[PDB]
Ligand binder design. Structure first.
Ligand SMILES: CCCCCCCC(=O)CC(=O)N[C@H]1CCOC1=O
Ligand SMILES: CCCCCCCC(=O)CC(=O)N[C@H]1CCOC1=O
Lengths: 162, 162
């Protein structure tokens, strides 16, 4: 946890975060951050190992307005699991189809709301065989994730905000 | 935690928040929240069972501007433990000495930063003989408190202001 805070720069910070996520049994992560009052989602600060094709397509298609995890983040400080039922609109249906093709089926997103108005998300995706297995897994590590997201946010904003 | 989310009104929500903190070892607590950019701390939505003399005295001589925990809250999302490591100035000396007289020797403060810009603090005080035991009491449930502060924040911001 405290290693995040000590890491000099983005690159080593990112590596620490990815490894910590890997330890817990997640295969993909995204840490994404925007400053206060900003809605420039396509130029957010992004770290992690999401597929670059997904990231580019997402930004090009403006999926930040479509991704149900992102609207949720703008509205809440509580985690959102990537349950089928968060994908409610036709476009979110297609979003899910496309996210699945990129390996992003099971996971959750922890909203980030930093001390200086930063808005963001920390998503963790797990490769699982079914929704029963995935959810039960995420539920096991959730208290750890909960502390992790705020440490990530404070240190991560700290390399971004300054 | 969901029993908090379902709370209809402030009084009802307050009782369950007080009960839960109490169940966790914290006989004194303060949930205080401001809307976006409200620096008038005496305007803040306030629940908990801090001694009323302390609160009114606090909200009148601008102890919010002296309290090291509030300074921290405007800069961090991470918890701050109440200790001389944070009370070090002379103006912060007597703050602690006075907080001590009111029974607030040991505790911690979870900064609050809600999704719509809300600013505030959830503070838990614990009764203990010494700081070693005090820290044990707090660190043992810190993951639970971490979840509780965000649950309190989301539900709370929706009752205070909505
Ligand atoms: C506020 C920061 C800007 C947003 C960066 C992109 C946010 C996300 O990509 C959220 C996220 O992890 N969504 C997941 C949900 C299934 O597919 C995804 O890509
Ligand atoms: C943003 C909220 C506006 C003012 C709310 C008061 C917050 C606090 O009272 C912080 C707090 O709990 N300080 C602790 C430290 C020892 O005595 C106290 O009263």
């Amino acid at each position: 946890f405290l290693e995040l805070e000590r890491s000099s720069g983005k690159l080593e910070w990112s590596a620490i975060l990815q490894k910590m996520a890997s330890d817990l049994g997640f295969s993909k992560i995204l840490f994404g951050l925007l400053p206060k009052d900003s809605q420039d989602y396509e130029n957010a600060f992004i770290v992690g190992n999401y597929p670059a094709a997904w990231r580019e397509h997402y930004d090009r298609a403006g999926y930040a307005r479509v991704d149900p995890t992102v609207s949720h983040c703008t509205q809440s400080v509580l985690p959102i699991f990537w349950e089928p039922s968060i994908y409610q609109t036709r476009k979110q249906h297609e979003f899910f189809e496309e996210a699945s093709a990129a390996g992003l089926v099971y996971g959750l997103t922890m909203p980030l709301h930093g001390a200086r108005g930063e808005l963001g998300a920390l998503s963790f995706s797990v490769e699982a065989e079914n929704r029963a297995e995935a959810n039960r897994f995420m539920e096991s590590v959730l208290p750890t994730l909960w502390m992790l997201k705020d440490y990530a946010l404070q240190s991560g904003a700290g390399l971004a905000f300054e």
